[PDB]
Amino acid sequence: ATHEVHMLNKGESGAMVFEPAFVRAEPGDVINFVPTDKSHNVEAIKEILPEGVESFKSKINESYTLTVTEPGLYGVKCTPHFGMGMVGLVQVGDAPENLDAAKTAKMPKKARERMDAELAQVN
Amino acid sequence: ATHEVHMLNKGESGAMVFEPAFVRAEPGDVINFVPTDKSHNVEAIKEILPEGVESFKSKINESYTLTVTEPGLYGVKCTPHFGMGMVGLVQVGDAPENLDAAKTAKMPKKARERMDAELAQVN
Ligand SMILES: [Cu+2]
Ligand SMILES: [Cu+2]
């Protein structure tokens, strides 16, 4: 299955956001990151990645297609707006093995506040 | 401004969901509840409504246009699927005066679990 996530300056939940910021996928699913607004990109938050998945970083203003194979939580951020809280979370499969990494990963306060909000949708 | 919320059987966060389940609006905003899938409706959760706003209930499979004037939290549910957790939350303005009603409103466990997840996006 395919999932679409928009990169927006202003979404339904706030400013500088991935929308939806939380996506529940299954192994083999495709996640398309679409820059609805310019100035955004998507990059993996290395601390929040399943074992065995390579880090990724797209170019600004470009679409990025992420194929999730490994189960676990995938944390993503927008490089220039990490500080302003532009983060997203993808949960592949049940009982994420790296739930505690996601819960304790050190990050800019706004991003940490949004990651926590997203973690509350887990399972 | 206008905000669109879809009623779905299966969304990006789970099954039987309002999507987005959390909308941040300003007084005078319009919220359109669109049944993307059939069998859903939107009805106000009376315990989670600002002072002075009338309760509302739309017919199944119908669109509903909610104009939010009063600031505060507006809780909505899908009548036939309340028990399965199909609830949504709208925050109009800052510092919702009825935040504690939303936090303690008695409701079916799944709905309560989802409401709490949505409350975490508040402010
Ligand atoms: Cu960005
Ligand atoms: Cu429903």
Which residues of A are known binding-site members? Answer: 40, 78, 81, 86
Using alpha carbons, select from A64, A45, A46 the residue that is nearest to residue A4: A64
Report which bound ligand comes closest to the CA of A39: 1
Q: Give one word for B110, left, alpha or beta, with left for phi > 0 and alpha for psi -120 to 50.
A: alpha
Rg of chain B taking only CA atoms, in angstroms: 13
3-state secondary structure of B83: helix
Chains A & B: contacts with CB separation below 8 Å: 32
What ranges do the domains of chain A cover? 1-123
**Structural contact between residues A77 and A87, judged by C-beta atoms closer than 8 angstroms:** yes
Amino acid at B59: K
Within A31-122, residue ranges assigned H as helices are 99-104, 109-119
Mutation for B interface: A3, A5, A6, A12, most B CBs within 10 A: A12
End-to-end CA distance of chain A: 19
Q: A10 CA distance to ligand 1 centroid (A)?
A: 10
* B34 near A CB under 8 A: no
Residues 103-122 of B with CB under 8 A from A: 116-117, 120-121
End-to-end CA distance of chain B: 19
Q: How many CB atoms lie within 10 A of CB B57?
A: 11
* CATH top class, domain B1-123: mainly beta
What span, in angstroms and rounded, lies between the C-alpha atoms of B62 and A52? 46
What span, in angstroms and rounded, lies between the C-alpha atoms of B81 and A63? 36
What span, in angstroms and rounded, lies between the C-alpha atoms of B1 and B23? 12
Q: A79 CA distance to ligand 1 centroid (A)?
A: 7
Resolution of the coordinates in A? 2.5
What span, in angstroms and rounded, lies between the C-alpha atoms of A24 and B23? 19
What span, in angstroms and rounded, lies between the C-alpha atoms of A40 and A80? 7
